[PDB]
C-alpha cells in the first residue's frame, strides 16, 4: 500500500491521473519524482521548469554543479539528484526531443531508467514541449517499465484521450 490517490489503473504496474506533477509531488512526497530533463539539466520550461520553480531554483543550482563535475547526460540517460521539497530524490531522465531531431527509438532507453526504482511519480517522457506523441509515449512506458509508475498528466483533455485510446 502507498499514498497515491485517484489514479486509474492501466496495467499491473502503470497508473495514470490528471494532475499537476508539482502539486502531486508536493502532497505525496514520493521517494522518486521523474523530471523531463535535457542533457544539460537546463530546467527552463515544461515539466522541468515547473519542478525547478517549485524548488525556488535549488534544483537548477544543484544541477549546474552536477554538470560542471560530470558533463552532460546522454539522450536516453538519467541521473539521480535531490528531490528538494518535492520528493526524496529526483530522477532526471532525458527523453528524445523531437523538436531537436532526436531518435524516437531512444524513448525506450529513457523509460528503462525507471526500472531502477521500485515506485515513481513521473510525467510522460518526450511529451509536451519535447514534441513526441503522448499516446506513443504511454505505449512505450507500459511496454518498458516493470516497476510501479504513477503518471501525472497535466492537461485534462490529453488525459481523457490517453485513457480512451488505451489498448
Ligand atoms: C501536452 O503535454 C504536456 O502537458 C507537457 C508539455 O511539455 C509534457 C509533459 N508536461 C507536464 N506533465 C505533467 N505535469 C505537469 N505540470 C506542469 C507544469 C508546467 F508549468 C508545465 C508542464 C507541466 C506538466 C507538460
From Swiss-Prot:
The record's subcellular location field reads:
Host endoplasmic reticulum membrane
Q: Which residues form the signal peptide?
A: none
Reactions accelerated catalytically: Thiol-dependent hydrolysis of ester, thioester, amide, peptide and isopeptide bonds formed by the C-terminal Gly of ubiquitin (a 76-residue protein attached to proteins as an intracellular targeting signal)
> What's its membrane topology?
Multi-pass membrane protein
Q: How is its activity regulated?
A: Inhibited in vitro by GRL-0617.
- Where the record annotates domain Macro, the positions are 1-167
Described by its record, this protein's role is as follows: Responsible for the cleavages located at the N-terminus of the replicase polyprotein. Participates together with nsp4 in the assembly of virally-induced cytoplasmic double-membrane vesicles necessary for viral replication. Antagonizes innate immune induction of type I interferon by blocking the phosphorylation, dimerization and subsequent nuclear translocation of host IRF3. Also prevents host NF-kappa-B signaling. In addition, PL-PRO possesses a deubiquitinating/deISGylating activity and processes both 'Lys-48'- and 'Lys-63'-linked polyubiquitin chains from cellular substrates.
The record's note on quaternary structure and interaction partners says: May form homohexamers. Interacts with N protein.
Mind telling me what this protein is named?
Papain-like protease nsp3
Intact protein stretch covered?
1025 to 1191 of 7096
Amino acid at each position: 500500500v502507498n499514498s497515491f490517490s485517484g489514479y486509474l489503473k492501466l496495467t499491473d504496474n502503470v497508473y495514470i491521473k490528471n494532475a499537476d506533477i508539482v502539486e502531486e509531488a508536493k502532497k505525496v512526497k514520493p521517494t522518486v519524482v521523474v523530471n523531463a530533463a535535457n542533457v544539460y539539466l537546463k530546467h527552463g520550461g515544461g515539466v522541468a521548469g515547473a519542478l525547478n520553480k517549485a524548488t525556488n531554483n535549488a534544483m537548477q543550482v544543484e544541477s549546474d554543479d552536477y554538470i560542471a563535475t560530470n558533463g552532460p547526460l546522454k539522450v536516453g540517460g538519467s541521473c539521480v539528484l535531490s528531490g528538494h521539497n518535492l520528493a526524496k530524490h529526483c530522477l532526471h531522465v532525458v527523453g528524445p526531443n523531437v523538436n531537436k531531431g532526436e531518435d524516437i527509438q531512444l524513448l525506450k532507453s529513457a523509460y528503462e531508467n525507471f526500472n531502477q526504482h521500485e515506485v515513481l511519480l513521473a510525467p510522460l517522457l518526450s511529451a509536451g514541449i519535447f514534441g513526441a506523441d503522448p499516446i506513443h509515449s504511454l505505449r512505450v512506458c507500459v511496454d518498458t517499465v516493470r516497476t510501479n509508475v504513477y503518471l501525472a498528466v497535466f492537461d485534462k483533455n490529453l488525459y481523457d484521450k490517453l485513457v480512451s485510446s488505451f489498448l
